[PDB]
Amino acid sequence: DEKKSTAFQKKLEPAYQVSKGHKIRLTVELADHDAEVKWLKNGQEIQMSGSKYIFESIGAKRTLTISQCSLADDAAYQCVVGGEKCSTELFVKE
Numbered sequence: 001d002e003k004k005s006t007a008f009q010k011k012l013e014p015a016y017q018v019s020k021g022h023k024i025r026l027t028v029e030l031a032d033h034d035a036e037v038k039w040l041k042n043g044q045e046i047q048m049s050g051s052k053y054i055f056e057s058i059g060a061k062r063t064l065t066i067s068q069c070s071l072a073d074d075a076a077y078q079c080v081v082g083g084e085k086c087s088t089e090l091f092v093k094e
């Protein structure tokens with residue numbers, strides 16, 4: 001089940017609004033703070049890449065920078081550490 005459990009102290013609101021092609025960031029307050037965060041596309045498991053699923057960290061608050069994601073990747077992106085996922089819906093804004 002996708003649910004708070006993940007090493008994300010707080011996962012951001014379950015509706016991330018990507019500014020299409022502007023690269024949407026998946027901001028969370030990490031529980032780990034400085035751990036490599038893996039993320040999930042609804043059903044799809046999302047690793048990390050310097051082109052998509054970009055990991056970025058600010059003061060524990062972890063961020064998944066997703067590039068090339070606009071009026072197509074409109075769906076849901078969960079957040080995952082090791083193998084723990086918390087669901088968040090992904091909506092794209094043009």
